[PDB]
């Protein structure tokens, strides 16, 4: 069937000092896919990791092609946009919705950790939604392998986004990969339930963070969060990564298992 490999780029989905993402529509089938265009003027590693991914809560990777200095990455199109835009400033979103999104985020993270991959930059801007509002973890440009041949590799590279980064990244030379992603998921949960980020960064120098360690939950954003989910956040946002709750235990949390959301 001629023309089936032709795609028209009809809309800009993203743009930054790195390249852009365009919505591509198949000339014949009208199928919609996202095309990441990067000028190799890093990408190799991102592609390598994307080739390992196959999960309903992770942006699907269809393949790639390069023409000289430009690399084209064909990725799953999530028409619902970024989770970031479903969060109402200073309000958040309905708890049931947040719980559903959190369940899907955990599913995706469990999957990634299961194959030894850590995302390292989990935040609402990198969590996309499909037409049925299903969450998809996106952008593996900062991702890396932390387990290979059943052997764990401690990380040392400082990366991510400050408001979402775990404290050990700023205090220790080396650290385990998994607790760092768990922490970021905790910050995302806080954002979904309060519509605001708790601190600029998890440092003792940051007043907001010191207040949290001092358990002053009568202050924002904590006072806007119900007791059940707040109890979970108390277990996730723990400074010592070794004492921080693991995903298997997050799955056993009272709030995590509370019936709240009706089916579509």
């Amino acid at each position: 069937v001629p023309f089936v490999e032709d795609w028209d780029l009809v809309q800009t989905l993203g743009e930054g000092a790195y390249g852009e993402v365009q919505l591509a529509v198949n000339r014949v089938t009208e199928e919609a896919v996202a095309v990441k265009i990067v000028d190799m003027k890093n990408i190799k590693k991102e592609i390598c990791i994307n080739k390992m991914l196959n999960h309903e809560n992770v942006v699907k990777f269809y393949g790639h092609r390069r023409e000289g200095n430009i690399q084209y990455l064909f990725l799953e199109y999530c028409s619902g946009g970024e989770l970031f835009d479903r969060i109402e400033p200073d309000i958040g979103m309905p708890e049931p919705d947040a719980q559903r999104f959190f369940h899907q985020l955990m599913a995706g993270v469990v999957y990634l950790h299961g194959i030894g991959i850590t995302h390292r930059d989990i935040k609402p801007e990198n969590l996309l939604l499909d037409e049925r509002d299903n969450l998809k973890i996106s952008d593996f440009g900062l991702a890396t392998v932390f387990r290979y041949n059943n052997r764990e590799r401690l990380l040392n590279k400082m990366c991510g986004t400050l408001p979402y980064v775990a404290p050990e990244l700023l205090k220790r030379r080396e650290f385990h990969a998994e607790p760092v992603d768990v922490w970021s998921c905790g910050i995302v949960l806080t954002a979904m339930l309060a519509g605001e980020l708790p601190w600029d960064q998890p440092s003792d120098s940051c007043q907001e963070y010191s207040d949290w360690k001092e358990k002053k939950t009568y202050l924002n954003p904590w006072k806007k969060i119900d007791s059940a989910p707040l109890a979970l956040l108390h277990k996730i946002l723990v400074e010592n990564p070794s004492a921080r709750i693991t995903i298997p235990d997050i799955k056993k949390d009272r709030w995590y298992n509370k019936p709240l959301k009706k089916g579509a």
């Binding site: 032709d6 591509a24 393949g63």
Partner: peptide, 5 residues
């Protein structure tokens, strides 16, 4: 703009 798969 357009691209080929």
């Amino acid at each position: 703009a357009s691209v080929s798969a």
